[PDB]
Design a protein around this nucleic acid. Structure first.
Ligand SMILES: [Mg+2]
Ligand SMILES: [Mg+2]
Ligand SMILES: [Mg+2]
Ligand SMILES: [Mg+2]
Ligand SMILES: [Mg+2]
Ligand SMILES: [Mg+2]
Ligand SMILES: [Mg+2]
Ligand SMILES: [Mg+2]
Ligand SMILES: [Mg+2]
Ligand SMILES: [Mg+2]
Ligand SMILES: [Mg+2]
Ligand SMILES: [Mg+2]
Ligand SMILES: [Mg+2]
Ligand SMILES: [Mg+2]
Ligand SMILES: [Mg+2]
Ligand SMILES: [Mg+2]
Ligand SMILES: [Mg+2]
Ligand SMILES: [Mg+2]
Ligand SMILES: [Mg+2]
Ligand SMILES: [Mg+2]
Ligand SMILES: [Mg+2]
Ligand SMILES: [Mg+2]
Ligand SMILES: [Mg+2]
Ligand SMILES: [Mg+2]
Ligand SMILES: [Mg+2]
Ligand SMILES: [Mg+2]
Ligand SMILES: [Mg+2]
Ligand SMILES: [Mg+2]
Ligand SMILES: [Mg+2]
Ligand SMILES: [Mg+2]
Ligand SMILES: [Mg+2]
Ligand SMILES: [Mg+2]
Ligand SMILES: [Mg+2]
Ligand SMILES: [Mg+2]
Ligand SMILES: [Mg+2]
Ligand SMILES: [Mg+2]
Ligand SMILES: [Mg+2]
Ligand SMILES: [Mg+2]
Ligand SMILES: [Mg+2]
Ligand SMILES: [Mg+2]
Ligand SMILES: [Mg+2]
Ligand SMILES: [Mg+2]
Ligand SMILES: [Mg+2]
Ligand SMILES: [Mg+2]
Ligand SMILES: [Mg+2]
Ligand SMILES: [Mg+2]
Ligand SMILES: [Mg+2]
Ligand SMILES: [Mg+2]
Ligand SMILES: [Mg+2]
Ligand SMILES: [Mg+2]
Ligand SMILES: [Mg+2]
Ligand SMILES: [Mg+2]
Ligand SMILES: [Mg+2]
Ligand SMILES: [Mg+2]
Ligand SMILES: [Mg+2]
Ligand SMILES: [Mg+2]
Ligand SMILES: [Mg+2]
Ligand SMILES: [Mg+2]
Ligand SMILES: [Mg+2]
Ligand SMILES: [Mg+2]
Ligand SMILES: [Mg+2]
Ligand SMILES: [Mg+2]
Ligand SMILES: [Mg+2]
Ligand SMILES: [Mg+2]
Ligand SMILES: [Mg+2]
Ligand SMILES: [Mg+2]
Ligand SMILES: [Mg+2]
Ligand SMILES: [Mg+2]
Ligand SMILES: [Mg+2]
Ligand SMILES: [Mg+2]
Ligand SMILES: [Mg+2]
Ligand SMILES: [Mg+2]
Ligand SMILES: [Mg+2]
Ligand SMILES: [Mg+2]
Ligand SMILES: [Mg+2]
Ligand SMILES: [Mg+2]
Ligand SMILES: [Mg+2]
Ligand SMILES: [Mg+2]
Ligand SMILES: [Mg+2]
Ligand SMILES: [Mg+2]
Ligand SMILES: [Mg+2]
Ligand SMILES: [Mg+2]
Ligand SMILES: [Mg+2]
Ligand SMILES: [Mg+2]
Ligand SMILES: [Mg+2]
Ligand SMILES: [Mg+2]
Ligand SMILES: [Mg+2]
Ligand SMILES: [Mg+2]
Ligand SMILES: [Mg+2]
Ligand SMILES: [Mg+2]
Ligand SMILES: [Mg+2]
Ligand SMILES: [Mg+2]
Ligand SMILES: [Mg+2]
Ligand SMILES: [Mg+2]
Ligand SMILES: [Mg+2]
Ligand SMILES: [Mg+2]
Ligand SMILES: [Mg+2]
Ligand SMILES: [Mg+2]
Ligand SMILES: [Mg+2]
Ligand SMILES: [Mg+2]
Ligand SMILES: [Mg+2]
Ligand SMILES: [Mg+2]
Ligand SMILES: [Mg+2]
Ligand SMILES: [Mg+2]
Ligand SMILES: [Mg+2]
Ligand SMILES: [Mg+2]
Ligand SMILES: [Mg+2]
Ligand SMILES: [Mg+2]
Ligand SMILES: [Mg+2]
Ligand SMILES: [Mg+2]
Ligand SMILES: [Mg+2]
Ligand SMILES: [Mg+2]
Ligand SMILES: [Zn+2]
Lengths: 97, 94, 66, 104
RNA sequence: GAGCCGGUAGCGGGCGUGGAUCCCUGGAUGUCCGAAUGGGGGAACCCGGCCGGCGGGAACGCCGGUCACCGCGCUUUUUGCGCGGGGGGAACCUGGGGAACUGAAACAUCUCAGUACCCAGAGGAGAGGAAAGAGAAAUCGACUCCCUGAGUAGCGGCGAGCGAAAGGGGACCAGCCUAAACCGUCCGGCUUGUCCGGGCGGGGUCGUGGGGCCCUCGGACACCGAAUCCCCAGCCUAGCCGAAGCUGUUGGGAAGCAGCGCCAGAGAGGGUGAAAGCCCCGUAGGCGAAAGGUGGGGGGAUAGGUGAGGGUACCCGAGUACCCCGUGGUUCGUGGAGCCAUGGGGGAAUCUGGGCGGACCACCGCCUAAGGCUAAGUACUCCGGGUGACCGAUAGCGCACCAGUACCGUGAGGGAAAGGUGAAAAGAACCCCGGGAGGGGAGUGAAAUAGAGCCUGAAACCGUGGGCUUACAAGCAGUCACGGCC
RNA sequence: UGCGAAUGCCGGCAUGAGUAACGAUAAAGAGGGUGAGAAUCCCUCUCGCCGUAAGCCCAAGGGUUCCUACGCAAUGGUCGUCAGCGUAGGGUUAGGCGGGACCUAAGGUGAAGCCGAAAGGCGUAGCCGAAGGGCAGCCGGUUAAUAUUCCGGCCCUUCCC
RNA sequence: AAGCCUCUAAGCACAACCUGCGGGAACCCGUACCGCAAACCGACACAGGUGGGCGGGUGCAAGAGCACUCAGGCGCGCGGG
């Protein structure tokens, strides 16, 4: 679970590719791969900790989608409950029907 | 069902078991799951007797072989019951 | 036959009596055990079809409540 | 196991040593597919001196015949195969011999 | 439709034409463990709460019922309730992850290979699917699968090797729901306002661009019609009918041989004492469901669908397209490297908008992304059936036999051997030797060196009897010659 | 589809060979018994060995081996009439002993919570977890075989009313 | 950590608790047998390994040592020469 609670973004596997030599297009004989190996790429994930109704709700999101946390706060109707709260404010409110 | 002729299986028949008729002590094969308490009531209502002490013990199957195939007879349980002073169980007096 | 009638008399006779009739046959069965156990005192098949007829009763007893 | 012939029946023994003889089926064994007619096949089985017939050495007994070995007698013939009719409600046997009882 | 109480005889008892046993459908009962779910726990054991019951029954015990967690939904949050989920499945399927040996005759890129495998999920299939496609023809029209294109185009330490698509021929055939504009309703927040927001209903769903809003046209029976529901046929889960031969003869046995017959929509095949169309069971041809399953076919219903011109420029899926960085997918290994995907940064517009035709620019075309669903043609084989120039007990599955067993391993796990008397038990009464075992008679049998350590019964091996031979010869043991004895 | 070889595979049967060995150098002898059969079984006598054990009691572990009747194919390193072996029958009795309807330890597990591609890791309380803590039975008789369990005497504990 | 005692809290104080006495109530599992070994771990009736307790007497300085012995148990499952 290092995954963005709004966007859905999660870590992907990627190769890290080590190259040598001069681009063919700089008049080099061309690039060469000295190694290829798997790494991954995490989302740039942050806390957004926000106050909604009585309570203080904390989203874990990709820094990318940080705005949508505030969009979800602009959606306010009638919740006096505990944390959860976002269980409501979430995909129920992100999409629904 | 509500038993109680389910709880009491059969009289156990041996020099040992017979030697208990002399005192108030009658001894039966009972169903393996039966608590001392319910064995009491099952005898109290089967033989119209008062039961003042129950003793139980489990009896393990004996492994037996018909040749090539070995297995074991069922595990049993037996209760030896103390009927109240002077009472007896005539059903067991043959 | 016997069974046909036994099954027929058992319906129309309903449940408290069915329970009592069971409790009876059960006790009649326990007696049967004892006699086979002490040996020579039983000619079997009565053990079998008493057991069985207790089933038949109990199966009707089940009909009646459902 | 369908057979053809039953207990009451009268059969002719169509093959073997007892070939040609007619007798009544004394018993039918569907599991071994055998009928034992009598006294249409007998044999001699030596027996021990234990109780009844203590002194007895031997016994004659009727050995089952393969159910194919025999054919139904057909009241008047010694054929048939067999056939089937219906009317109401159902059931039958008939001689395609033809045409006859069994029945008994 | 006459026998039955399994393999299994026997003792000792019972049942069946008043229709048993047995087969098929439904039901009932269904201890305890197990997702295991009251709570524990070393699975098959232990300990409880609540309501009810039993016993003399308060203590004790038994019985019935109820009580896990998670998600969704309404509900006054609450007392809660409803519905669902969970686990298993031979292979097949998708998705998340993902090797090495090996190949390169060394080895790094490359290969093996997105394989093995591990994980999640789905179902009887799964996936995919209704163009921001192809890609050179004013071309084609969803998706999947086969053939072909083609070992082509390409890719490539341009090595080893990797390896497309368009098109054509087939199989199958199907197309739909939405978001927004706009209208209506309910509720919530309020700095009551032609307000903002959420919920529901309507509306609308496309690329010869569509739709909303305004005007005009008539827009009337309409026609169309499900993938949803209902009925029905048919199919599956038991069964049933089903032609035509006798005699004689050898023989233990006829089905052989002989005589004279007969059936055939049936001369497939298996049995029966040996070799049988006509003895048995079948076969060709027919028939059959009260009940449960199915039902893609037939029928019917319902849901849904259905216009023209003008004018407005209101809407047409956002952290999205687009650009850049890092990568993956493709035949494409950085290459002129686009296209599809996306971890990071910046970050639009709504038809005069956007994406694409292999860097980029023009021109000319194609298509309308950022929501969703969609039979069939396809994969598989735990399961049932039918066939075999498939095996026939060292073979065929590991197992033809009470095998995933014995046994071996702490465990994961490994893992065997072992079929055949006879047509029929007629499975050898009785006597004899003997403690028994065994054998001799007797008897059974066509046969008993078919006698159960039983079909055939090879060879190595062991033995008894007989013939020739051998104790002054010595050698790969044989061979050629002569002679003796049988 | 033809086997003689692969330290081939599976099976069978040879050779070595009546050979080595028969598992502690604590040690045997005789009389009687039984039985088809006796060095080997039973009983007497004598002799030898253990005795901080080679005796007795408990916990693991084993799981009927227990007691008795009948029995000797095989198992027993010989023999077997015996047996820990075959067949059969019997045999284990608890309010107080052990454990559980008590506690907590390491550790485990885990409402909350935290983390992690999935699987899953972590974690407060709680819960589980004992050869620790807590808790009420002693002496004797009895069976072929059980006894702080049955019986006899003398004591005790907790729940309910 | 509980049992245990004390303290109070809501609560209840016609409850409750304490002490004494009396009547009743008291469930599940283990219990044979071997257990320094022929019954456990060692393919074996294997000279190996296996935790706790008791372990008598006489003598030798002491002792759980050594010798001999009690109770109890054994002469080791081939023998004869
Ligand atoms: Mg890099
Ligand atoms: Mg912040
Ligand atoms: Mg940004
Ligand atoms: Mg007990
Ligand atoms: Mg009847
Ligand atoms: Mg016929
Ligand atoms: Mg009928
Ligand atoms: Mg009988
Ligand atoms: Mg009928
Ligand atoms: Mg059924
Ligand atoms: Mg029941
Ligand atoms: Mg449970
Ligand atoms: Mg309960
Ligand atoms: Mg649990
Ligand atoms: Mg109650
Ligand atoms: Mg699953
Ligand atoms: Mg499932
Ligand atoms: Mg994958
Ligand atoms: Mg490599
Ligand atoms: Mg390598
Ligand atoms: Mg290489
Ligand atoms: Mg090489
Ligand atoms: Mg190398
Ligand atoms: Mg690859
Ligand atoms: Mg599923
Ligand atoms: Mg499908
Ligand atoms: Mg789909
Ligand atoms: Mg490849
Ligand atoms: Mg094509
Ligand atoms: Mg089409
Ligand atoms: Mg709508
Ligand atoms: Mg509004
Ligand atoms: Mg709407
Ligand atoms: Mg609509
Ligand atoms: Mg327009
Ligand atoms: Mg027929
Ligand atoms: Mg003759
Ligand atoms: Mg003839
Ligand atoms: Mg001829
Ligand atoms: Mg034939
Ligand atoms: Mg012929
Ligand atoms: Mg034939
Ligand atoms: Mg037919
Ligand atoms: Mg506009
Ligand atoms: Mg672009
Ligand atoms: Mg690539
Ligand atoms: Mg690339
Ligand atoms: Mg390169
Ligand atoms: Mg371009
Ligand atoms: Mg694009
Ligand atoms: Mg294009
Ligand atoms: Mg295009
Ligand atoms: Mg669009
Ligand atoms: Mg779309
Ligand atoms: Mg689909
Ligand atoms: Mg099959
Ligand atoms: Mg074989
Ligand atoms: Mg085999
Ligand atoms: Mg063979
Ligand atoms: Mg095999
Ligand atoms: Mg094992
Ligand atoms: Mg003769
Ligand atoms: Mg003979
Ligand atoms: Mg012969
Ligand atoms: Mg023979
Ligand atoms: Mg034969
Ligand atoms: Mg032979
Ligand atoms: Mg000779
Ligand atoms: Mg000389
Ligand atoms: Mg000479
Ligand atoms: Mg020499
Ligand atoms: Mg030899
Ligand atoms: Mg020698
Ligand atoms: Mg020597
Ligand atoms: Mg020697
Ligand atoms: Mg010895
Ligand atoms: Mg010795
Ligand atoms: Mg001493
Ligand atoms: Mg034990
Ligand atoms: Mg053992
Ligand atoms: Mg035994
Ligand atoms: Mg003994
Ligand atoms: Mg004896
Ligand atoms: Mg022996
Ligand atoms: Mg011996
Ligand atoms: Mg024994
Ligand atoms: Mg007591
Ligand atoms: Mg506990
Ligand atoms: Mg505890
Ligand atoms: Mg944990
Ligand atoms: Mg403890
Ligand atoms: Mg303790
Ligand atoms: Mg205690
Ligand atoms: Mg004592
Ligand atoms: Mg004892
Ligand atoms: Mg006492
Ligand atoms: Mg506590
Ligand atoms: Mg009291
Ligand atoms: Mg005991
Ligand atoms: Mg004992
Ligand atoms: Mg010790
Ligand atoms: Mg000892
Ligand atoms: Mg011993
Ligand atoms: Mg020994
Ligand atoms: Mg030892
Ligand atoms: Mg041992
Ligand atoms: Mg030690
Ligand atoms: Mg001392
Ligand atoms: Mg001393
Ligand atoms: Mg001293
Ligand atoms: Mg000294
Ligand atoms: Mg000493
Ligand atoms: Zn006739």
């Amino acid at each position: 679970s290092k995954v963005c609670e709004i966007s859905g973004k999660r870590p992907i596997v990627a190769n890290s590719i080590q190259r040598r030599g001069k681009a063919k297009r700089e008049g080099g004989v061309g690039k060469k791969t000295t190694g290829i190996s798997k790494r991954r790429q995490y989302p740039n994930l942050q806390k957004v900790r926000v106050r909604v109704a009585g309570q203080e709700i904390t989203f874990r999101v990709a820094a990318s989608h940080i705005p949508k946390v505030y969009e979800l706060v602009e959606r306010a109707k009638g919740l006096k409950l505990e944390g959860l709260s976002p269980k409501e404010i979430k995909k129920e409110l992100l999409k629904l029907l | 069902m509500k038993t109680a002729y389910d709880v009491i299986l059969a009289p156990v028949l041996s020099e040992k078991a017979y030697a208990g008729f002399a005192e108030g002590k009658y001894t039966f094969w009972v169903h393996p799951k039966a608590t001392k308490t319910e064995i009491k009531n099952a005898v109290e209502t089967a033989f119209k007797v008062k039961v003042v002490k129950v003793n139980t013990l489990h009896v393990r199957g004996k492994k037996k072989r018909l040749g090539r195939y070995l297995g074991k007879r069922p595990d049993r349980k037996k209760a030896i019951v103390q009927v109240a002073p002077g009472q007896k169980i005539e059903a067991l007096e043959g | 036959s016997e069974v046909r009638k036994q099954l027929e008399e058992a319906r129309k006779l309903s449940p408290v009596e069915l329970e009592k009739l069971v409790r009876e046959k059960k006790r009649e069965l326990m007696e049967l055990r004892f006699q086979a156990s002490i040996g020579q005192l039983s000619q079997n098949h009565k053990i079998r079809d008493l057991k069985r007829q207790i089933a038949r009763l109990l199966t009707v007893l089940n009909e009646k409540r459902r | 196991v369908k057979m053809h012939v039953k207990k009451g029946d009268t059969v002719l023994v169509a093959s073997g040593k007892y070939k040609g003889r007619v007798g009544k089926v004394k018993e039918v064994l569907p599991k071994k597919y055998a009928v034992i007619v009598e006294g249409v096949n007998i044999v001699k089985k030596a027996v021990r001196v234990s109780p009844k017939y203590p002194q007895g050495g031997f016994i004659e007994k009727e050995a089952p015949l393969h159910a194919s070995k025999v054919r139904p007698i057909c009241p008047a013939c010694g054929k048939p195969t067999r056939v089937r009719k219906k009317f109401l409600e159902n059931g039958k046997k008939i001689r395609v011999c033809a045409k006859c009882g069994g029945a008994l």
